[PDB]
Amino acid sequence: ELELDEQQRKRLEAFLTQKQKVGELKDDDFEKISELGAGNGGVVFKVSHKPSGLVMARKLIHLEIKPAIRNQIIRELQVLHECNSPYIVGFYGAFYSDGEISICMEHMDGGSLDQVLKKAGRIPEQILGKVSIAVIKGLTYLREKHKIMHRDVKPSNILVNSRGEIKLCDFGVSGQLIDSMANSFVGTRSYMSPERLQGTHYSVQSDIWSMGLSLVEMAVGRYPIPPPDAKELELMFGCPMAIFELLDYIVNEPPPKLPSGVFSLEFQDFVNKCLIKNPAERADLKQLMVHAFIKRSDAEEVDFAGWLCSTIGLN
Ligand SMILES: CCOC(=O)c1ccc2n[nH]cc2c1
Numbered sequence: 001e002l003e004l005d006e007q008q009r010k011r012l013e014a015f016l017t018q019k020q021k022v023g024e025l026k027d028d029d030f031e032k033i034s035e036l037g038a039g040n041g042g043v044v045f046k047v048s049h050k051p052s053g054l055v056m057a058r059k060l061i062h063l064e065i066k067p068a069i070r071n072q073i074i075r076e077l078q079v080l081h082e083c084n085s086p087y088i089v090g091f092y093g094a095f096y097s098d099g100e101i102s103i104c105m106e107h108m109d110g111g112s113l114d115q116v117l118k119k120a121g122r123i124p125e126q127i128l129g130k131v132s133i134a135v136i137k138g139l140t141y142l143r144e145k146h147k148i149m150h151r152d153v154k155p156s157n158i159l160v161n162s163r164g165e166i167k168l169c170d171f172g173v174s175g176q177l178i179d180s181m182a183n184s185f186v187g188t189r190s191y192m193s194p195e196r197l198q199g200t201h202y203s204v205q206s207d208i209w210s211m212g213l214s215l216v217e218m219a220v221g222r223y224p225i226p227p228p229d230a231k232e233l234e235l236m237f238g239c240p241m242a243i244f245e246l247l248d249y250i251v252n253e254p255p256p257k258l259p260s261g262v263f264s265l266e267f268q269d270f271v272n273k274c275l276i277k278n279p280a281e282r283a284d285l286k287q288l289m290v291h292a293f294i295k296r297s298d299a300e301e302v303d304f305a306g307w308l309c310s311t312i313g314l315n
Helices: 006-021 067-081 113-120 125-144 175-180 204-220 230-236 243-252 265-274 292-299 304-312
Strands: 030-035 043-049 054-062 091-097 100-106 158-160 166-168
Touching: 030 054, 067 091, 067 100, 067 175, 113 158, 113 204, 113 304, 125 158, 125 166, 125 204, 125 265, 125 292, 125 304, 204 265, 265 292
Parallel strands: none
Antiparallel strands: 030 043, 043 054, 054 100, 091 100, 158 166
C-alpha cells in the first residue's frame, strides 16, 4: 500500500542530492546556530555544516565510552542511509568526537508537536487527521523497508515543518546505542502501552497505543492520565501524581477517552480503537489505515502549513 506522488518523489530526490554533496562528517565542520533543546538522549542544536552550507540538527549524546562501543553504534546507524520516507526525518550521518556521539539529521523548522502543543493550547481535530495519517504511514514504512518498530511514539517525536510535512524521529535503530544508554537519559514510559509496562508481548501494537494517547493529549491540551473531573472540563471546553503511581494507573485502571460532544464520533472511535488495553483486540495498522476517520481525513484538504505558521508564528 506504500505509494508515492510527484511532489513527494521530487522532495525525496532533492534531499538525496543535497546529502550526496556532503562527505564524511567531522566536529570541526559544524557551526552552532541555536539550541532546539533536550532531547531523548542529550542535547539538540540547529547547526550549519560549513563546507556544504546546509542547515542540520545535531544530537549530542555525551557518553565517555571506549572506541569499540561507539564504532559499533555508527555501524548500526548507517542502516538509516537506505531509509527513504516522506514520513521519516532525514538522516545525514553519525560520528564520535571528544566526548559525544553526534547524529546529524534533516532540520524541521516547526519542531516537535510537544512544542506546537504549548503554543496552540490544543490542536484541532482536522489537523490531528493529517498527523494520524502521517504517524500511520511512518510506522507502516518502519515495519516494511526497515523491519523494526518505532518503540517511542510521543508528541516530542513527531516533527513538523513550514512545507506542511510531518515526520517521525528518535526511534530505536541502533540496539547498542540504547544498551549504552542504560544510565544516561532513559525515555519517559508514560506513553508506553499497559503491556510494555508488564514486559509481555510487544509489536507494532504498542506504537498504536502510544499514538492514540499522543492524539488524546494533543486534542485536549493536557496529558490524559489521570482523567480530569467535569470541573476541569468546564475550565477546558465549557460543555499531583508521581511517575510510578501514573504507570501503575495505566496498567490497572480503564483507558483515557476524548470528551463527548466536543469531538466527532469517528475520531472518538479512532482513538478508542487505539487505546484498547488488550493488544489482541487493539486495532492494527491495516484496520486503522482504512478507518472512517482516516478515510475522511485523507479526503479533506486541510491546510496544515497555514495553520502551523499562524500557530507557532513563523516569520
Ligand atoms: C527528539 C530529539 O530531537 C529533537 O528534539 C529535534 C527537534 C527539532 C528538530 N529539527 N530537525 C530535527 C530535530 C530534532
